[PDB]
Amino acid sequence: MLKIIIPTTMLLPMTWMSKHNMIWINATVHSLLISLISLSLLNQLGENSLNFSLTFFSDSLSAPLLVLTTWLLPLMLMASQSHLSKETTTRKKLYITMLILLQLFLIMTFTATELILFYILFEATLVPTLIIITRWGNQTERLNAGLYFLFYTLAGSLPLLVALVYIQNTTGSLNFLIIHYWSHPLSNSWSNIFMWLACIMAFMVKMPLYGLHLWLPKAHVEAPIAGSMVLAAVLLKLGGYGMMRITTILNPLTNYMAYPFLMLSMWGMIMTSSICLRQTDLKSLIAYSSVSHMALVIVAIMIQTPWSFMGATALMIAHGLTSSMLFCLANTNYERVHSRTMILARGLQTLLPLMATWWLVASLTNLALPPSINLIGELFIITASFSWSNITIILMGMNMMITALYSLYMLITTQRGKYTHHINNIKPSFTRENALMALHILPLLLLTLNPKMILGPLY
Amino acid sequence: CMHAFFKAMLFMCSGSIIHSLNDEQDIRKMGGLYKAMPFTTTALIIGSLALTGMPYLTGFYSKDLIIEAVNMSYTNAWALLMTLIATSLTAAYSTRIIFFAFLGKPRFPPLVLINENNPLLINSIKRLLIGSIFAGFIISNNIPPMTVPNTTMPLYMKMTALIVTIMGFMLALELNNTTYYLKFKYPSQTYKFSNMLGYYPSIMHRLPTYHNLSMSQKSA
Amino acid sequence: SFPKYKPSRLATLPATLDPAEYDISPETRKAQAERLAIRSRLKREYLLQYNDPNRLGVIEDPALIRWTYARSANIYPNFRPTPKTSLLGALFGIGPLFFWYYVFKTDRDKKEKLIQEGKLDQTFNISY
Amino acid sequence: PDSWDKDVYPEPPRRTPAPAPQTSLPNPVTYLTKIFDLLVDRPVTLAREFIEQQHAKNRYYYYHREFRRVPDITECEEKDILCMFEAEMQWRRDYKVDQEIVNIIQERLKACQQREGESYRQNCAKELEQFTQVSKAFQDRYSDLGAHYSARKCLAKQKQRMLAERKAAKEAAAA
Amino acid sequence: YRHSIFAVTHVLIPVWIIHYYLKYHVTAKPYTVVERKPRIFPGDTILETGEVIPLMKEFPDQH
Amino acid sequence: SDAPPLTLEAIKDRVLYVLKLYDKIDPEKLSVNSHFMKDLGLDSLDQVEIIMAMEDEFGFEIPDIDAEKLMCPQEIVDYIADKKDVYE
Amino acid sequence: EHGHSKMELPDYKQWKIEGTPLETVQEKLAARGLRDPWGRNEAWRYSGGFANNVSFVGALLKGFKWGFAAFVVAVGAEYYLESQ
Amino acid sequence: GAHLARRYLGDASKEPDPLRMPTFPPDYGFPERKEREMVATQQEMNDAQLMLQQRDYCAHYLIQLLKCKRDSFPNFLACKHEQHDWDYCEHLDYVKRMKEFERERRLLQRKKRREQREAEMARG
Amino acid sequence: QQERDPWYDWDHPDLRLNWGEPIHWDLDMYIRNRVDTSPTPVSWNTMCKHLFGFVAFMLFMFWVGEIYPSYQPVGPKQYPYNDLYLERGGDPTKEPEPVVHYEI
Amino acid sequence: AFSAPAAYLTHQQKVLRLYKRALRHLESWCVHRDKYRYFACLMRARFDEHKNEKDMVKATQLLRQAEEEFWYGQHPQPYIFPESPGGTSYERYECYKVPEWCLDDWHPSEKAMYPDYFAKREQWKRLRRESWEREVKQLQEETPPGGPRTEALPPARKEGDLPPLWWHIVTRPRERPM
Amino acid sequence: MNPFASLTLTTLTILTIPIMMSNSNIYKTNLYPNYVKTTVSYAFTLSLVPLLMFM
Amino acid sequence: GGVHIEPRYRQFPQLTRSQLIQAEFFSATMWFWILWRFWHDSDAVLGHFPYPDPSQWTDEELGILPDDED
């Protein structure tokens, strides 16, 4: 696992010793090479795992997340190249340093053979994103946003640490392998109920759960483009990964402790979806769509069936890619209009046809069109929930319909109709933006050809 | 399979009329095209005859068997009555199309641009015309049997489809002929119900959506 | 005499059937004149900016800013806890949750009772 | 073909009728298939013979891996982690083998349904019975284990099942 | 000539590729291609085993 | 489409033709510049009927605000040319 | 290649309300002391090749004569060939 | 249908119901009771694999018709005689069904008349 | 916004809005692509009454036709081999009660 | 469209609007031309029975029952011209239209084609650049103090001047650009 | 061997050739509609054969 | 792909003899097909098998005894 960590560390001296005008080129090239190296982790075995050492290991659930994390950084650099043009060399180098540190923390988080190390790195990921949001943010609310994004998370995760050390005082180890092999049932007691809550709420607050999701629209709207990309694609999946890793010890309590959350998700994925129908902001609409998808992922994980786990993993990967692409398109519009309001810039397909095509493809993937992996995860989770209870389909059905509606709404309001007359600063799209959308969309349609790479260890 | 042929040809004829009359779709402003444009006229006449299930045509092989099967099955009486009334109304609206689009005096703008002399339109229409004449017979004679046939019927139940088709023809023509009379009256409630599509598009597109969208902004 | 038309929320009264337009007073004419005056001021301001060859951007509209700010960021500072708001919030936030909880709990209890009693016929049910 | 075993995938003797022309008109089908043969089946066969001889020019082999049997979880001490590891790996391999057995049975059933035509309801009773038996066995073994399935959970399910069966037998005998 | 080159580059080449792929790869695996068993009527010769089907029970023919 | 590119002369000829079929107005007195209210002694209802005749003749409808202040054949021709973007 | 042929309008004196239902309309209007001011404008709709109309039954029987003659000839040939 | 009107506005117990028919023993009318014959055997009927709903007493003519259709394929209107035979045999089946319906109807008529006569005799 | 004047030169012809004018709290509710409150030829309550009456009448008479079905004066279809016992499901080792059909 | 609206509609205007609407809906009801002519003459006879009424009160009380009667018998599916705000091709070509300023973003290789057109375009740009600075002062000196009272623009009065705010009005993509 | 499968799949496969060629030069000329129409006619004529075999 | 035809303005449009002959030929073909099919297959339109009268069946083959035997 060091063959991937060490180059990520060397990205820092590489960046700081580069020329004043060659930071972007070198960073992009070497990040792409690191992603190519990370592609090797995709091969897996039906048996235990790839146990590299006592400190790190890999699995069919960690490998896709690592590949996506490594692939994202060049896209974030390409997106940030534009609005950071008038910055000093030191500040751009510091921005690249924050991105590199965030990638390294995520890489060490996803391997993390021991649970306390997982907690330490999972909370270490919080600092670079906070700095990114509160330092290079356009609006005046960014500061407030940061506070939210901080405290919510910490409020969730401080009890978890307690539980973890308590577990180590009881079981004697927090290594995931020993935990899996020496698992014992959890008796139905008040102490065990509170241990369950302490273990679960930390990952609930980050998914986010409906009712605990107030920080997400703020953080996604006020953050810069790279911050929004990394928040939507990878940072939301940390909660799902931790939940999948930790429910091996919570049984059989999860059979009946899951009831309050499931409903909160099953109803929530409706409410948030309806919210997307009445929104005056593109970034807010995308954030609420992310909330709906992650609530459905929560439902999947709480069902606790093999089909649930496969669907949840596929949906996590697909939603990450789709949300990053949508945020990128909204940013391309914003850098021209400087408004971030849906209704002001209209009829753009006449002026920007290829970006209209990119918008159409992104909406279609978000709409869960078959045979895209979005639909694969969608349908697997829906089937598992129907097995759980035949009534759930109703809610899922509603969600599906509403999804399509607002997706096409976002496509029709912005790209279709008559152009706004008084806007005349709409230049033809640059090669950088087209390359960014292509690099977002091609991996999705390539992954639909080999879905077994993103179905997790239960395939 | 039969409906594909004759419905596609009908839409081709309608589009030809629309293009020839400068993208005008309302039949109130299309007058005498029976002689002004004869190939579209004969194609639409054949399509209308096939639609109402006239014998030894594409419509006859399928629709006649549909009616015969629905008459001699353990089904609802209401469903049977509605099938018969629907067949009559089919004949009636085909009569409406032909009468209001081909028979009367011209009512289009004076600058006449009527023209069919294009090989593409003629060939495309005539291929589906040959289809709508012969494909039903060929195909019904080629497919092996797949159901028990209705050999014996009462004479009145055997001719019921033709009877209701001719009644629809005659009543529709009689009602359309009164439009030449010099009298005017305000429409009834039944006409308003039929014209506004049972008021289904209004109610169910204004009450549901609003009651959702408002909540989407107010509660959610 | 003809049947009266009854307007509704989703089918509004026609302009030609408003009794208010036939009640003409000098105050009404002054109102219409000043309405057109303010509309013409706004139109003139927008058109002066619109035809200027030097401008190469977006004409900032204060109305749009006001609308979006009122819709998004002006809700909580004007929110005041009242019996109406409290009751509606409690209903729309808690009632659906407990309703769905009761429904799903009843369904799953029924399924588990049938499974324990063994009369459910789960043949060919392999994947879950 | 010799690529797959005929006993694992049985097929009927596939009796087919002979052409009996009753009229003197020449049917288009034989002429069309003769033309298709001459125009397609010959160049494809030639290319495949060339490919096959090129392959025979350079020949090498690969082997199926054989796994030894190890003590299972039943004869495993409580905290002896190593033997639990061997038993878990062996149990997972057995799980995959059982999944592929069920896949083979399902493939047989689907092939029977497609082949038998309109008489599948009577002519495929054997495959349906075989699939019913194998599905009952698989469902008894592995169902309701959960996402975090393990050898100990399957052993516990089997233990509860055999306890219930023993109690039922004792009650029925002493009825 | 345009029709000839079209029927060569558009019909002949794909049909060659598909016939090769079906005959030498797809049919190498079992049950990939399954055919409906042909109908057998009384009086039929049967090519594979050369065994004839006996005729029916000579029903009473009239009208 | 296959719609011929109609010109100003065509517009004027058609407008004069439609006006000449109006038996209320004499053919000799009428001219391109002849006013409706004063030069020909017509009524407002007659003006709106003439506007309706133009609407039916040319296949497009004139909004009431711009139609009410259309009083001469020359300005009718000018309005139609402006609406349909006629070069010459 | 478009239609720039300088088409010329016909003479306005050609169109007359005589011999058309517009004449009956004018007589009915005169019975009440009324007169149509736009009667001659629509006269072209009843003047030329549009003067002759077709009934619905006649429209349906558009090619009945030739088809019937061909059917008679074919059935005669069938009768004279079968009786051999 | 007329029987519809007779059953629904007349007496329901006067006429049979089609779901539970027949309600009377086959030998109640006459004791001869000759059995129906089948020409096509089980194996040949399965081999032709007609349909489940096409496996009736009409099957031999259906198999002959399919034989004609397969044999004289391009001349899709050669064997009309076989189609006529199959249609005629189906017609005979339908007329037998109508005869059974009429027999049940008049058997119920005589049963009700006997019951009314017995009631009258008891009352007298 | 559907019932605003079509002819007027709005600065935004598609939305039918002018620059600087106040915007309705529910503009995105009414954008001519969504719910509109335009007047209709028939009153709303009459439309609702007619539509609901038609739907209820049709459902009721469908139920009535179910209660009073339609059929032909024929007996049940007769199938030869014990009501096709073997060809419908099978179970060949139970010897069902034979069914024999009545020739008339 | 082109004409500037007024603060209110005079009674004469409302009467004429009713006349046009009623005649159009009557034509929609009566398909055939002779029947339309007959009933249109009857309609105009019914319209001008009260042309000479003098008092305002009754004239306002009339034209009200007329509106109610028209709304009762309004032919719920009237005939609409294809390019009218309710027609079948109302906004068919809106997507085709492209603003002129898009041509400012063309690549020089694209501008190599059509050189005379771009020379003429540059001449138009120069003309607009001078005329705008003239027009701003012209409008500022011509407008009444406190703000305009109506949305009607004055014409050009001197020799070299052009009507104020003419660039947008003069250049339109077209009615059917493609 | 049994041209049925080859022809039935070949019709669906030929239907997708102009989609792949829509990136080529023919998509920028006026011959594209004729190209697609010819492809559809050829696909129809080719699919006419499996129907004949079924009959 | 067609031929040049000019507008007419209140006169009957110009017609080509080709479209006239094609339309008349195809209508004649439709009517000839209808007539020919009917002559050859009269039975399909009107039926071939008579519908027997249920009430005309004698009491013998319907199995009714004269109201006394059973």
Ligand SMILES: CCCCCCCCCCCCCCCCCC(=O)OC[C@H](COP(=O)([O-])OCC(O)COP(=O)([O-])OC[C@@H](COC(=O)CCCCCCCCCCCCCCCCC)OC(=O)CCCCCCCCCCCCCCCCC)OC(=O)CCCCCCCCCCCCCCCCC
């Ligand atoms: C079993 C025995 C078998 C033999 C049966 C007898 C044989 C036939 C007998 C004839 C019977 C009538 C046939 C003529 C049809 C009527 C034509 C007519 O007069 O229209 C003009 C007339 C008004 O015209 P207008 O307003 O002056 O318009 C001006 C121009 O004419 C505008 O003109 P336009 O140019 O715009 O368009 C003209 C158009 C305009 O015409 C229309 O407006 C169409 C609307 C009416 C026709 C629809 C009839 C279909 C009936 C289906 C109803 C299903 C149930 C729905 C119930 C809803 C309950 C609310 O007309 C047409 O083109 C053709 C119309 C139909 C004629 C052709 C088809 C008729 C044959 C089929 C019917 C019967 C044969 C069945 C065959 C099978 C054998 C059983 O329409 C009517 O007045 C309607 C009359 C019948 C309506 C009955 C429903 C009333 C219910 C009221 C409420 C009751 C209480 C409910 C309580 C519920 C509580 C839950």
Ligand SMILES: CCCCCCCCCCCCCCCCC[C@@H](O)O[C@H](CO[C@H](O)CCCCCCCCCCCCCCC)COP(=O)(O)OCC[N+](C)(C)C
């Ligand atoms: C804000 C948006 C959402 C945020 C997250 C919300 C999700 C967390 C909510 C907590 C989940 C459930 C908590 C407890 C579940 C255990 C089941 C128990 O409560 O039900 C009954 C328990 O009865 C009563 O519930 C007793 C507890 C009552 C006191 C709890 C407070 C109730 C409302 C608090 C909700 C506030 C949540 C937010 C806090 C900030 C069962 O009866 P009993 O057989 O006896 O107990 C069985 C368990 N034994 C065997 C160990 C004893």
Ligand SMILES: CCCCCCCC/C=C\CCCCCCCC(=O)O[C@H](COC(=O)CCCCCCC/C=C/CCCCCCCC)COP(=O)(O)OCCN
């Ligand atoms: C986004 C906001 C979410 C904030 C987090 C909410 C989750 C709160 C979790 C509960 C808090 C305490 C967690 C304890 C950590 C696990 C340790 C454990 O389980 O050991 C128990 C100890 O359990 C406890 O003592 C827990 C007592 C709770 C004290 C703190 C109260 C905090 C608030 C409680 C209610 C809120 C929980 C739900 C909140 C939902 C989110 C808002 C057994 O102790 P022993 O004595 O050794 O064994 C008994 C046999 N002799």
Ligand SMILES: CCCCCCCCCCCC(=O)SCCNC(=O)CCNC(=O)[C@H](O)C(C)(C)COP(=O)(O)O
């Ligand atoms: C199917 C739809 C049914 C339609 C029903 C409608 C029935 C309408 C009947 C109502 C009758 C009336 O007008 S109600 C009569 C209202 N009162 C007056 O009209 C008095 C003064 N009239 C004017 O001023 C006019 O404009 C005039 C002088 C005519 C024009 O003048 P010019 O031209 O010189 O400008």
